[PDB]
Design a protein around this ligand. Structure first.
Ligand SMILES: CC(=O)SCCNC(=O)CCNC(=O)[C@H](O)C(C)(C)COP(=O)(O)OP(=O)(O)OC[C@H]1O[C@@H](n2cnc3c(N)ncnc32)[C@H](O)[C@H]1OP(=O)(O)O
Length: 154
């Protein structure tokens, strides 16, 4: 961290419009107004990422109680294409993993990744996520429609 050009910051009503703007560019699906209202209620489970003080990415997660487990679902985690491979993803993912580790009550953390997304698959597998399922027809309008479920056991 010493001398890093990357910092995470809180999401607030002042910068929620910035988060939406980033999400629009980065992710191929659009999120509704309820999504953005919810982000304001999850505390440290949502953050904006800054590179040299410029907002370039974001992470939004929620707690999911399914399969009789307590799970952390990564709804969105990403940064703008020109700033990729600079460790921003790592900073965001490590933040969420540290929240789970300090809580200690999570069974697993998981997300969906479109099957064509090789760089996301490489990235999550680096952190010990495993492809546990491939969901056919996960997306309704984009191609390929299929998504891998990537899960890390905690
Ligand atoms: C519709 C969907 O599928 S959404 C769910 C997936 N997320 C996205 O598609 C959002 C768009 N993508 C991104 O924002 C990025 O590509 C991310 C979040 C996946 C990775 O973020 P980055 O900031 O680029 O990752 P970071 O620089 O921390 O990468 C760390 C590690 O990941 C691995 N990695 C990351 N990107 C790549 C790549 N393109 N190719 C191979 N390995 C990669 C590397 O092993 C390793 O780092 P190093 O080899 O550079 O030391």
């Amino acid at each position: 961290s010493k001398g890093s050009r990357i910092e995470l910051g809180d999401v607030t009503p002042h910068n929620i419009k910035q988060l939406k703007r980033l999400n629009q560019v980065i992710f191929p699906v659009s999120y509704n107004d309820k999504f953005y209202k919810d982000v304001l209620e999850v505390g440290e489970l949502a953050k904006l990422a800054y590179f040299n003080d410029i907002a370039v990415g974001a992470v939004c997660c929620r707690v999911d109680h399914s399969q009789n487990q307590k799970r952390l679902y990564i709804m969105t985690l990403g940064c703008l294409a020109p700033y990729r491979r600079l460790g921003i993803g790592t900073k965001m993912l490590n933040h969420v993993l540290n929240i789970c580790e300090k809580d200690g009550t999570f069974d697993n953390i998981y997300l969906h990744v479109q099957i064509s997304n090789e760089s996301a698959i490489d990235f999550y597998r680096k952190f010990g996520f495993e492809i546990i399922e491939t969901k056919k027809n996960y997306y309704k309008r984009i191609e390929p429609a299929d998504a891998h479920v990537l899960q890390k056991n905690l």
